[PDB]
Design an enzyme around this catalytic site. Structure first.
Site, PDB file in Angstrom:
ATOM      1  N   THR A 159       0.663  -1.429   0.078  1.00  0.00           N
ATOM      2  CA  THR A 159       0.096  -0.130  -0.038  1.00  0.00           C
ATOM      3  C   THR A 159       1.059   1.332  -0.076  1.00  0.00           C
ATOM      4  OG1 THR A 159      -1.197  -1.170   0.712  1.00  0.00           O
ATOM      5  CG2 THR A 159      -2.094   1.389   1.412  1.00  0.00           C
ATOM      6  N   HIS A 265      -7.911  -8.626   2.628  1.00  0.00           N
ATOM      7  CA  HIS A 265      -6.795  -9.743   3.810  1.00  0.00           C
ATOM      8  C   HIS A 265      -7.996 -10.610   4.004  1.00  0.00           C
ATOM      9  CE1 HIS A 265      -3.626  -8.250   3.045  1.00  0.00           C
ATOM     10  NE2 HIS A 265      -4.074  -6.424   2.680  1.00  0.00           N
TER      11      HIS A 265
HETATM   12 ZN   LIG Z   1      -3.448  -4.674   2.125  1.00  0.00          ZN
END
Ligand SMILES: [Zn+2]
Ligand SMILES: *[C@@H]1O[C@H](CO)[C@@H](O[C@@H]2O[C@H](CO)[C@@H](O[C@@H]3O[C@H](CO[C@H]4O[C@H](CO)[C@@H](O)[C@H](O[C@H]5O[C@H](CO)[C@@H](O)[C@H](O)[C@@H]5O[C@H]5O[C@H](CO)[C@@H](O)[C@H](O)[C@@H]5O)[C@@H]4O)[C@@H](O)[C@H](O[C@H]4O[C@H](CO)[C@@H](O)[C@H](O)[C@@H]4O[C@H]4O[C@H](CO)[C@@H](O)[C@H](O)[C@@H]4O)[C@@H]3O)[C@H](O)[C@H]2NC(C)=O)[C@H](O)[C@H]1NC(C)=O
Ligand SMILES: N#Cc1ccc(Cn2c3c(c4cc(Cl)ccc42)CCN(C(=O)CCc2cnc[nH]2)C3)cc1
Ligand SMILES: [Ca+2]
Ligand SMILES: [Ca+2]
Ligand SMILES: [Cl-]
Ligand code: NA
Ligand code: NA
Length: 806
Positions: A159, A265
């Site tokens: 990210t 996730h």
């Molecule tokens: Zn992630």
């Protein structure tokens, strides 16, 4: 310390941040627990929800309301986003036919189309198709606007590195955010995902879009939002900013969504639970567009829908543990997960040694699910070496896997079913791009491209000059209706010499031998013309590469290949040749097995010598133009010229020989002829840039022959392969590689097998963009084609990934 004594009244989501201990009202204050006591009450109102209802129409304004349905709301720019649909009988943006936006249709006072960046974390490329049924607003954006089938993130596909690449156009190694987690040995400080030090400032290099806008007089919304600010409030705030007076109103905005990454996730990229997060993102896009439609801004604003990275299936049970490999596992620190970085736990440990660690991690289990690398030996396409925060030892982990230090780290610290971070050519890591607006094209699909290119385009969309960056400015011109950036070719810095025959054979004392002395005006005149460049139009299809730095070099013509020969480095910078579909592979005749011939056009003082190779017990030599592809037995003597010779480790010769003898002919038959340019690369400081002569760390023993760190090739053909490579009317097609020049084949676990079982796989791993090779060589390719320069810039940024279809 925040003496949160002040107030937020009239300051909600203030664009300018405030200096402690005055309490903050900006959209990041929540994150730092430093808002004013009244922030929730004044800025995060919720009463009555997020939508207008029939009975709320024309209501008296009530400031306790989240958003308003009164008559004045449009003036104020704080209506609920569905107001005109419920109270004025308008339609939802998603239900309108799309209509090409030929020009910006903006309210008076707008000096340029605003840009709204709508970033989604973890939005995997295949969601666009696979979720299309539950995302009608996004699907409308995609089909009506300009879109790529997917966008390639940078490595690591995490990210923070990707969001900051999006903002700067820089590789992580240059902007400095090389991970979600990092250690900087110079600061002796860690950067953590959660908490403080993150925000210190000294971590962030380059120049992000919001600073670029500001410095050039363009005002920016903030690009950051606290997790507890509801998505609907984010949208409303941007809509409100857009209603500000001309002098205050920002021109660039970013919305960020923690989804679908957050749920991916937990559930994996396609878990059944994934549908609702997709529906919610779509609903938010719907709100933005309805909101804009209401403010009459839905044909005025450029909208980018963009992802940072994809998401792969990963579970605890697919973890490799270093404690299964290293006896010394307590002497190392691992940055763990979908990549590995290793350094010494203690710098006062003199018994720590990276070579023994690398060796203990190298091909130890039959189906080993990661591969260890000194970071300078990582595929160059990853551009992941030139930062003190990247550890010398790197683990490239297989898709679907994790690496950890010890079993205790996993079960004592199964939760998750998805993760990302893997090699940026992996399909599940690919993310999305859609541009919609007056400045983008209408219903246009563009080829996949890399996220480092976007900064330049966002600069173009705003009328900004971009800071220096890793995009190739112009390579994304075909996304744009107008505001294109028309660069010029860089100017050649060095001009070539064209030496003729100037040395007698006996002037060479090189230790070389060749059984060639066995020799007619038909073919004596002919051969002279070949040396004058008479077949050069066949072998130099796109012009000669320009040399972009100061050096001294010669052009050498031959019947079958042309070369640009460096007198500084004693070898070609590039060798160019064309192999037609019909070309035949011959072998090296026995009598020419160890033949090296002096080149009478190049002084002994600028030549390599066979004795150095003889003496150098580790180093052998190969040829840039392969003897195997000579057009005739007479033409084959040119291939043994000393000026076609390059230093090669015997281990690398196995790779190079298979490429030259087998793969070039194979590509030539699959592509209908290919043009090849091959050469050496010297990048001893692993910064992705051509080394100068004083940067070379290794020479052939007892000589001044420098040893390449890599060998490249660029293979060009007609995109329309019914046309021969040398007779191509239109767009070109390219693949390239940058092969590490290594004294062993430890990188290839199967290398004791026949080259047909391992070489092509190594080459695929080391696929490259022509642009990668340009930085590494200071050369500039495709100078003379009949194609537009922007199209050639696109070709030069193409990466052939060898992944199956997205
Ligand atoms: Zn992630
Ligand atoms: C991708 O795009 C980027 C951007 O275009 C490319 O990166 C550029 O590469 C340039 C050429 O290598 C490099 O230019 C050098 O600048 C030096 C001054 O640097 C400062 O100023 C710039 C401009 O504002 C700034 O951006 C720099 O910021 C870096 O440093 C900090 C951390 O240290 C970070 O906040 C930031 O992320 C960035 O880090 C990255 O860059 C540095 C290198 O600059 C790396 O080492 C880091 O690891 C990281 O990757 C700086 O604040 C200047 O010193 C250089 O000049 C030296 O060499 C020249 C040759 O021209 C010579 O004439 C000079 O005399 C000088 O030599 C002397 O100093 C040497 C070093 O101290 C010494 O050894 C000698 O003996 C001499 O005394 C040089 O011009 C430019 O900084 C970066 N920019 C960025 C943003 O990274 C990148 O190459 C592209 N990638 C590819 C593959 O194409
Ligand atoms: N295209 C595009 C685009 C869009 C936004 C940004 C900006 N931005 C954001 C993050 C970030 C990290 C770095 Cl290293 C650099 C830039 C970064 C983290 C998540 N972001 C949050 O807003 C959550 C904040 C939070 C999470 N937890 C507490 N606060 C956004 C950059 C590019
Ligand atoms: Ca030798
Ligand atoms: Ca270099
Ligand atoms: Cl990381
Ligand atoms: Na001879
Ligand atoms: Na091997």
């Amino acid at each position: 310390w925040t003496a949160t004594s002040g107030s937020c009244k009239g300051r909600c989501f203030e664009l300018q941040e405030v200096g402690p201990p005055d309490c903050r009202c900006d959209n990041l204050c929540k994150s730092y627990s430093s808002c004013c006591h009244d922030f929730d009450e004044l800025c995060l109102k919720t009463a009555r929800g997020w939508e207008c209802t029939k009975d709320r129409c024309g209501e008296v304004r009530n400031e306790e309301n989240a958003c308003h349905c009164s008559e004045d709301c449009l003036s104020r720019g704080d209506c609920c986003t569905n107001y005109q649909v419920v109270c004025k009988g308008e339609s939802h943006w998603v239900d309108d036919d799309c209509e090409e936006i030929k020009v910006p249709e903006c309210p008076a006072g707008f000096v340029r189309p605003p840009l709204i960046i709508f970033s989604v974390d973890g939005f995997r490329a295949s969601y666009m198709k696979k979720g299309s049924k539950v995302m009608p607003n996004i699907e409308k954006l995609r089909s009506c606007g300009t879109h790529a089938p997917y966008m390639r993130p940078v490595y690591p596909t995490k990210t923070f590195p990707n969001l900051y690449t999006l903002a700067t156009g820089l590789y992580p190694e240059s902007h400095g955010i090389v991970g979600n987690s990092m250690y900087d040995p110079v600061f002796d400080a860690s950067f953590h995902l959660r908490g403080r030090e993150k925000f210190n400032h000294r971590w962030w290099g380059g120049q992000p879009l919001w600073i670029t806008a500001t410095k050039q007089g363009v005002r920016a919304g903030t690009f950051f939002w606290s997790v507890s600010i509801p998505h609907e409030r984010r949208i409303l705030t941007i809509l409100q900013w857009l209603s500000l007076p001309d002098n205050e109103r920002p021109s660039v905005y970013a919305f960020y969504s923690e989804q679908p990454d957050f749920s991916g996730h937990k559930y994996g990229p396609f878990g059944p639970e994934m549908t609702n997060p997709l529906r919610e993102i779509d609903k938010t896009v719907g709100q933005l567009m309805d909101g804009l439609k209401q403010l009459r801004l839905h044909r005025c604003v450029n909208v980018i829908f963009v992802g940072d990275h994809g998401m792969e299936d990963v579970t605890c049970d697919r973890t490799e543990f270093l404690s299964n490999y290293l006896t010394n596992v307590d002497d190392i620190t691992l940055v763990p997960g979908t990549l590995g970085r290793i350094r010494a736990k203690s710098i006062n440990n003199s018994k720590y040694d990276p070579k023994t660690i690398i060796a203990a991690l190298t091909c130890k289990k039959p189906d080993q699910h990661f591969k260890p690398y000194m970071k300078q030996h990582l595929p160059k396409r990853l551009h992941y070496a030139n930062n003190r925060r990247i550890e010398d030892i790197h683990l490239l982990v297989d898709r679907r896997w994790h690496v950890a230090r010890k079993p205790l780290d996993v079960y004592k610290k199964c939760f998750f079913q998805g993760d990302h971070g893997f090699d940026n050519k992996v399909n599940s890591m690919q993310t999305v791009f859609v541009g919609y607006g007056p400045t983008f094209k209408y219903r246009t699909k563009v080829p996949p491209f890399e996220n480092i290119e976007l900064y330049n385009v966002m600069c173009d969309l705003l009328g900004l000059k971009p800071a220096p960056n890793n995009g190739t400015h112009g390579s994304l011109n075909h996304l744009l209706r107008t505001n294109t950036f028309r660069p010029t070719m860089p100017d050649e810095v060095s001009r070539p010499n064209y030496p003729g025959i100037m040395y007698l054979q006996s002037e060479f004392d090189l230790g070389c031998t060749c059984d060639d002395k066995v020799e007619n005006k038909l073919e004596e005149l002919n051969k002279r013309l070949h040396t004058k460049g008479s077949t050069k139009e066949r072998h130099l299809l796109y012009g000669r590469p320009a040399v972009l730095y100061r050096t001294s070099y010669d052009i050498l013509y031959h019947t079958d290949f042309e070369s640009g020969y460096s007198e500084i480095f004693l070898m070609p910078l590039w060798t160019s040749y064309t192999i037609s579909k019909q070309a035949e592979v011959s072998s090296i005749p026995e009598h020419l097995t160890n033949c090296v011939r002096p080149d009478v056009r190049v002084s002994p003082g600028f030549s390599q010598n066979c004795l150095a190779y003889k003496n150098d017990k580790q180093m052998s030599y190969g040829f840039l133009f392969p003897p195997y592809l000579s057009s005739s037995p007479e033409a084959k003597y040119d291939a043994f010229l000393v000026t076609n010779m390059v230093p090669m480790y015997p281990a690398f010769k196995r790779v190079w020989a298979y490429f030259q003898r087998v793969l070039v002919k194979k590509y030539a038959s699959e592509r209908n002829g290919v043009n090849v340019i091959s050469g050496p690369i010297f990048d001893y400081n692993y910064d992705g840039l051509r080394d100068t002569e004083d940067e070379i760390k290794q020479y052939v023993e007892g000589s001044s022959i420098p040893v390449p760190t890599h060998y490249y090739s660029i293979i060009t053909s007609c995109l329309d392969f019914t046309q021969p490579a040398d007779k191509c009317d239109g767009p070109l097609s390219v693949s390239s590689f940058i092969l590490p020049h290594r004294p062993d084949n430890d990188e290839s676990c199967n290398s004791s097998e026949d080259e047909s079982k391992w070489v092509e796989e190594l080459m695929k791993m080391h696929t490259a963009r022509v642009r990668d090779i340009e930085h590494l060589t200071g050369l500039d390719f495709y100078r003379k084609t009949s194609r537009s320069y922007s199209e050639i810039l696109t070709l030069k940024t193409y990466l052939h990934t060898y992944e199956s279809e997205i």
